[PDB]
Amino acid sequence: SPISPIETVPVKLKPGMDGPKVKQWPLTEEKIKALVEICTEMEKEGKISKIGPENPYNTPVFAIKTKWRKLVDFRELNKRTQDFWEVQLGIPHPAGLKKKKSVTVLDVGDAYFSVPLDEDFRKYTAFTIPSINNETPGIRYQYNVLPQGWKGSPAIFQSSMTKILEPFRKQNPDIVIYQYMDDLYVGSDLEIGQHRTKIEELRQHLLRWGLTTPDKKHQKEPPFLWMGYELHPDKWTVQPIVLPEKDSWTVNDIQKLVGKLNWASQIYPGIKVRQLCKLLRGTKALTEVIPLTEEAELELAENREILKEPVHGVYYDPSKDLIAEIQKQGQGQWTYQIYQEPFKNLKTGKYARMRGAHTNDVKQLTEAVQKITTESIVIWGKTPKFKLPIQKETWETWWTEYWQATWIPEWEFVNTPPLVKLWYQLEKEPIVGAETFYVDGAANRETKLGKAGYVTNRGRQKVVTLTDTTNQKTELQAIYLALQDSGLEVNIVTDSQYALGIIQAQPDQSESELVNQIIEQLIKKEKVYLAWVPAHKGIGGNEQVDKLVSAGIR
Amino acid sequence: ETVPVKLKPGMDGPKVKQWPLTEEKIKALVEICTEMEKEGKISKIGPENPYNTPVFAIKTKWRKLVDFRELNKRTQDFWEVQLGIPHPAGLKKKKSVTVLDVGDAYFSVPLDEDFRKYTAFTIPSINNETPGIRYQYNVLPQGWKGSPAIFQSSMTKILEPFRKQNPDIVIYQYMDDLYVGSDLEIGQHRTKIEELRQHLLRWGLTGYELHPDKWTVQPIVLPEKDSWTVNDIQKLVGKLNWASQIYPGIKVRQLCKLLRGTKALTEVIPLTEEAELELAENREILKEPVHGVYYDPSKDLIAEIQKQGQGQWTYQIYQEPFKNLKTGKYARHTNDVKQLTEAVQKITTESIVIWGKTPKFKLPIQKETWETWWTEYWQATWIPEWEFVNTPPLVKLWYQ
Numbered sequence: 031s032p033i034s035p036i037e038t039v040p041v042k043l044k045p046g047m048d049g050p051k052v053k054q055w056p057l058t059e060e061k062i063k064a065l066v067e068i069c070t071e072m073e074k075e076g077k078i079s080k081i082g083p084e085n086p087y088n089t090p091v092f093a094i095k096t097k098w099r100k101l102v103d104f105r106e107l108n109k110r111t112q113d114f115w116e117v118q119l120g121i122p123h124p125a126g127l128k129k130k131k132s133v134t135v136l137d138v139g140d141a142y143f144s145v146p147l148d149e150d151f152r153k154y155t156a157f158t159i160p161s162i163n164n165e166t167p168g169i170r171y172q173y174n175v176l177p178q179g180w181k182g183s184p185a186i187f188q189s190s191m192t193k194i195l196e197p198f199r200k201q202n203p204d205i206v207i208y209q210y211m212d213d214l215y216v217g218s219d220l221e222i223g224q225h226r227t228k229i230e231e232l233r234q235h236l237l238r239w240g241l242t243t244p245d246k247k248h249q250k251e252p253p254f255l256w257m258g259y260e261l262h263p264d265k266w267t268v269q270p271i272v273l274p275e276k277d278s279w280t281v282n283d284i285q286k287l288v289g290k291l292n293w294a295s296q297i298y299p300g301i302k303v304r305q306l307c308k309l310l311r312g313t314k315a316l317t318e319v320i321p322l323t324e325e326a327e328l329e330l331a332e333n334r335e336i337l338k339e340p341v342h343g344v345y346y347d348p349s350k351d352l353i354a355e356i357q358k359q360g361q362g363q364w365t366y367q368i369y370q371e372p373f374k375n376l377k378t379g380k381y382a383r384m385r386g387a388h389t390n391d392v393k394q395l396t397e398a399v400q401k402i403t404t405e406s407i408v409i410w411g412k413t414p415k416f417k418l419p420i421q422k423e424t425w426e427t428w429w430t431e432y433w434q435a436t437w438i439p440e441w442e443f444v445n446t447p448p449l450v451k452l453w454y455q456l457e458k459e460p461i462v463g464a465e466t467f468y469v470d471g472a473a474n475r476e477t478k479l480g481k482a483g484y485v486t487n488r489g490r491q492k493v494v495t496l497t498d499t500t501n502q503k504t505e506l507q508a509i510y511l512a513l514q515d516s517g518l519e520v521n522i523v524t525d526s527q528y529a530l531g532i533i534q535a536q537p538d539q540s541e542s543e544l545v546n547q548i549i550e551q552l553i554k555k556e557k558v559y560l561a562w563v564p565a566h567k568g569i570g571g572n573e574q575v576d577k578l579v580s581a582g583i584r
Numbered sequence: 585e586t587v588p589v590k591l592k593p594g595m596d597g598p599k600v601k602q603w604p605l606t607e608e609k610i611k612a613l614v615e616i617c618t619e620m621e622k623e624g625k626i627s628k629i630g631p632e633n634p635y636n637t638p639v640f641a642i643k644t645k646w647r648k649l650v651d652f653r654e655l656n657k658r659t660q661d662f663w664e665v666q667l668g669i670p671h672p673a674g675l676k677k678k679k680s681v682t683v684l685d686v687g688d689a690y691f692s693v694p695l696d697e698d699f700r701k702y703t704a705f706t707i708p709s710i711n712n713e714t715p716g717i718r719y720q721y722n723v724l725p726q727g728w729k730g731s732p733a734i735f736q737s738s739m740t741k742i743l744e745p746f747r748k749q750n751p752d753i754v755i756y757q758y759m760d761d762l763y764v765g766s767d768l769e770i771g772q773h774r775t776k777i778e779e780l781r782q783h784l785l786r787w788g789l790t791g792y793e794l795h796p797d798k799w800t801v802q803p804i805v806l807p808e809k810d811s812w813t814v815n816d817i818q819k820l821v822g823k824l825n826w827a828s829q830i831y832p833g834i835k836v837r838q839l840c841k842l843l844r845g846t847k848a849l850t851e852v853i854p855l856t857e858e859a860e861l862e863l864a865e866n867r868e869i870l871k872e873p874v875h876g877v878y879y880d881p882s883k884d885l886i887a888e889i890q891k892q893g894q895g896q897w898t899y900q901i902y903q904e905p906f907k908n909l910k911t912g913k914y915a916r917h918t919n920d921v922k923q924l925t926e927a928v929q930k931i932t933t934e935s936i937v938i939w940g941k942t943p944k945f946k947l948p949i950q951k952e953t954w955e956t957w958w959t960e961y962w963q964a965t966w967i968p969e970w971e972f973v974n975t976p977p978l979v980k981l982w983y984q
């Protein structure tokens with residue numbers, strides 16, 4: 031196997047650091063023999079060279095098993111090697127692949143061993159095959175090539191592959207080359223002949239540079255199995271997903287289930303994972319059996335149904351626009367599809383996130399549009415045209431009245447229920463002929479006890495005692511009280527910016543049962559006007575609820 | 585001959601991830617970089633450079649914008665202490681200030697061989713087909729604060745005839761731009777800019793018009809009403825109780841006296857003339873600058889922006905919260921992101937003119953919406969630092 035004639039990549043150690051000096055542990059005779067055999071073969075091939083006694087560095091060697099393998103413990107050298115640039119920013123996604131007339135897979139033979147190592151850095155790769163019972167001096171070698179397990183190998187190989195491919199890519203702009211690890215994926219729209227000719231020209235260019243690749247009878251045939259994907263000539267899919275039928279599910283079983291479903295989510299539309307994920311909440315043992323809930327059984331059933339039949343994705347056509355469609359699956363769950371030609375999907379996906387403790391479908395939909403937008407730029411270098419289950423008017427009302435700079439690129443309403451709506455709207459001005467509730471909450475921070483209440487301009491009053499509470503929980507409880515004893519139209523005055531904030535953002539869902547109860551009330555209401563005052567300023571009705579809730583508390 | 589650049593001790597070069605870029609923006613950068621390489625300004629690099637700085641393309645011709653925010657922070661001692669450019673107090677007083685892009689000057693001066701690695705950037709690829717195209721600078725890079733710092737001496741000799749001939753023209757160099765101010769009539773001012781463009785033209789280097797003297801306060805506005813409701817007074821006392829934390833001599837005692845008993849919000853309540861006395865007196869304090877607030881050169885500047893609806897935005901610049909050095913407003917086919925980037929740029933240029941430093945922004949937006957979109961509208965050669973905030977609902981109405 032050749033060692034590429036390319037210019038070496040200069041390697042440095044970390045500033046203030048010298049090479050490893052880790053003592054070789056004595057080995058068994060069988061391990062020493064195995065290593066001697068291995069090392070003399072590599073020495074012949076040019077891979078390693080014998081060194082003198084002057085070299086003071088050392089990295090330990092070991093051998094494991096009918097054939098023997100040599101394992102170098104590069105942990106110490108790796109701790110002293112300079113940092114390298116990140117090999118890759120991401121992984122190619124199948125949906126980003128164009129449909130090519132012919133595609134061939136070329137894997138590089140003994141990749142790392144085919145590329146030289148900086149002459150001035152070779153000294154730090156020094157290792158010793160010990161003598162029987164460490165009696166006499168050992169056999170000393172250093173690497174001439176990129177060693178397996180060393181920190182710079184992935185990076186230096188990739189960089190070497192880049193400089194090599196450079197002149198070929200310049201003279202063949204209509205040829206696709208995917209660089210992945212020690213593989214090269216070559217695609218073109220040439221006729222089955224001039225492509226076969228171009229592959230040999232590539233193979234030959236690579237050989238002139240120490241890199242060996244398979245010939246026609248050894249190169250793989252489609253479908254290509256790569257990274258959990260199946261790449262057929264006119265479609266792609268995920269590899270066979272088989273969901274286990276278990277009597278008892280363990281933490282580990284559900285974890286593997288969730289992972290498999292998540293992976294299936296990229297092409298199979300409608301995959302749900304919330305109810306299964308909920309079972310994984312908390313601290314439970316790998317082998318601990320989790321009984322499924324009704325909701326988890328229902329979600330598993332729907333998922334088995336989705337996966338019953340096989341689904342495929344199509345490839346990318348650069349001359350067509352991408353269309354992204356989103357649907358509300360349920361509570362906090364969003365599902366999307368991306369296509370160019372109606373309903374022939376390139377890919378699919380899901381969004382189920384909790385951005386805060388209080389949110390709404392409008393905020394969730396914009397969060398999903400941003401997630402999809404980013405993804406599209408990564409996969410295709412362009413954003414899609416959205417088809418959203420929200421009316422232009424609902425969106426317009428939200429962005430106009432919300433405090434946050436909220437935006438959505440080119441979109442269109444699509445009537446695919448459940449539709450995204452605002453469940454209630456707060457008043458802009460106080461209501462004439464509605465009772466004004468002044469609300470307050472106060473909790474003692476030693477006892478944890480608090481009081482929640484209100485006073486009205488109609489002389490009405492109420493004070494409820496609460497047990498293991500906070501000032502925030504009491505303030506929210508006070509609002510709930512005022513909503514409960516109110517009637518269709520209310521003006522509410524609070525000194526809580528915290529409560530003001532939650533309610534003002536029009537939440538339709540919360541991780542707080544109290545906030546969900548407030549939502550239930552706000553919906554039933556015809557008109558609500560929420561106003562704010564500074565606390566402890568002796569303000570009108572505010573000083574009155576203050577004295578009432580403070581009594582025996584603060 | 586290169587000026588040796590040393591990084592701040594203990595910390596090393598920037599290792600900042602590259603953002604996804606659209607097909608159009610990548611092609612624009614590849615074309616730009618191929619050319620800069622041919623011209624020897626940038627060199628293709630090895631994997632042995634662990635450093636990275638993000639790169640973007642802005643706009644009628646595409647231009648490369650390198651985000652040196654992390655490199656700048658890491659070289660602060662160099663461009664600020666060691667090689668600082670003094671900021672003129674006169675610039676903010678000038679009737680006109682023209683901004684000129686002078687960043688093309690930087691590529692005539694080489695970068696210290698031992699600092700070049702710290703300028704690494706990557707042109708990304710679509711669907712990760714290709715490893716990014718990696719490069720580093722051989723010349724002073726545009727967007728790095730160390731560039732005007734080093735070029736300072738060369739800029740001094742280019743401007744010397746112009747300055748000797750025009751002693752009342754203020755010239756300030758901030759990053760890639762030159763800020764040229766005069767108290768002349770607009771025609772004579774525009775004539776003097778053309779004259780300076782000719783001086784710059786003999787050395788290689790090749791307008792945007794501000795009027796700093798016509799920049800005024802955005803006072804905390806106190807309403808002027810016939811009928812005052814319980815709610816209107818409550819809203820007024822809230823606004824004044826908060827202004828009293830900034831401004832010395834604010835009084836609410838008389839307006840507060842009115843808010844007695846648990847009254848209905850819609851109830852019209854007559855005013856007491858002593859309450860009108862306070863109103864008048866507070867309105868007067870609110871129009872004038874804040875007493876006791878001074879710019880501290882060693883402390884960072886903060887800018888806060890609030891969406892007011894109807895395409896209007898309010899902002900405040902301070903160093904210590906609510907101790908406001910400046911307040912203002914930005915008013916607008918536009919969207920919130922486009923509007924927000926426009927306000928960020930206007931506030932930054934005013935901040936450069938007034939203090940010689942960009943503020944760190946508290947943006948009322950989603951990190952992701954901002955990240956994906958900001959480049960679609962960005963026009964400036966610099967990028968300020970920014971945080972993402974959840975605007976308190978009251979800060980919005982007290983600044984309305």
Ligand SMILES: NCc1cc(Cl)cc(Oc2c(Cl)ccc3c2nnn3Cc2[nH]nc3ncccc23)c1Cl
Pocket residue numbers: 122123124127128129130131132133134135206207208215216217218252253254255256261262263264345
């Ligand atoms: N190791 C996997 C692998 C991963 C990656 Cl990320 C890229 C790969 O190579 C392709 C190239 Cl170079 C171009 C189009 C492709 C490819 N793969 N699929 N399609 C679409 C396509 N066009 N024509 C095809 N003919 C046969 C199979 C798929 C085809 C390969 Cl084989």
